[PDB]
Design a protein around this ligand. Structure first.
Ligand SMILES: O=C(O)C(=O)Nc1sc2c(c1C(=O)O)CCOC2
Length: 297
């Protein structure tokens, strides 16, 4: 079990070296388009880029570049798009991505402001009466409503492709108390948020991949995707002991660099997957306990 692994790791206390090891083994593939001079103002961090092979291409003639990747989990049969927090010049690209890729959900794990700094553009309308038009990629976006909980909010957004006037509804799941380079307050509130995204239908192979972002699209997003895929993998077979957590993080880092930013986020992933296995293994009663524990209202 991952659970025995956990206990070994904790008792020796070697999370850092374990994480060190993941970092040393992770793949390294080129990011030449991300590094082209034209794309400088499209990347938020110099040292966080999409790999060329897995990047998302915009369906524009101009410049198809966005800092986003498709994480395509073959065995689990689930994909996500991981991306950075949109910059002020790329919010139009971000929604073009959502449109072209046919996503139904956007999972945001950061606040706009963190640690004194602007981690992300305000890329969605905070009120119904004030829509956003993105003239560059010709899209319009309206808040339809939202559902504010103590640690998270769910918005319903209407996205319109102005050119054809086709519209779609996007669900936005905003986790607002997961610290940059930190962990959730607990596995319970993490799982509570994750199962809310799952319940909503957005992960569900009739839609495009869910878009997951934090500020860089690697630390908080990798943690979220790692726990989700681990639980999925375990569901298809009903076999916890077939899931190798480190190795699934390593399959994911084939598609985007840097997924999971610290050893305690790695450690939090084992906690999350070990708690969530109770639900996958057929005690659905823990779901309701997570919700209590989480203090959602
Ligand atoms: O938002 C996250 O969870 C995340 O991965 N962020 C990251 S990863 C990363 C940075 C940041 C940041 O927010 O400043 C700054 C550059 O180094 C790597």
């Amino acid at each position: 079990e991952m659970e025995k692994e956990f206990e070994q790791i904790d008792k020796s206390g070697s999370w850092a070296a374990i994480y060190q090891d993941i970092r040393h083994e992770a793949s390294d593939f080129p990011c030449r388009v991300a590094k082209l001079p034209k794309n400088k103002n499209r990347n938020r961090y110099r040292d966080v880029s999409p790999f060329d092979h897995s990047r998302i291409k915009l369906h524009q003639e101009d410049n198809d570049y966005i800092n986003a990747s498709l994480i395509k989990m073959e065995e689990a049969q689930r994909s996500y798009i991981l991306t950075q927090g949109p910059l002020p010049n790329t919010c139009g690209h971000f929604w073009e991505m959502v449109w072209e890729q046919k996503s139904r959900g956007v999972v945001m794990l950061n606040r706009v402001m963190e640690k004194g700094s602007l981690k992300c553009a305000q890329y969605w309308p905070q009120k119904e009466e004030k829509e956003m038009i993105f003239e560059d990629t010709n899209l319009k976006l309206t808040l339809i409503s939202e559902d504010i909980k103590t640690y998270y909010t769910v918005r319903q957004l209407e996205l319109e492709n102005l050119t054809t006037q086709e519209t779609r509804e996007i669900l936005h799941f905003h986790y607002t108390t997961w610290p940059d380079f930190g962990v959730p307050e607990s596995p319970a509130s993490f799982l509570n948020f994750l199962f809310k995204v799952r319940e909503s239908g957005s992960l569900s192979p009739e839609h495009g991949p869910v878009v997951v972002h934090c500020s860089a699209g690697i630390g908080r997003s990798g943690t979220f995707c790692l726990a989700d895929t681990c639980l999925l993998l375990m569901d298809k077979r009903k076999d916890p002991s077939s899931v190798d957590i480190k190795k699934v993080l390593l399959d994911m880092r084939k598609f985007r660099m840097g997924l999971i930013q610290t050893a305690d986020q790695l450690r939090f992933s084992y906690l999350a997957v070990i708690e969530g296995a109770k639900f996958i293994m057929g005690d659905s009663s823990v779901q309701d306990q997570w919700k209590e524990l989480s203090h959602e209202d």
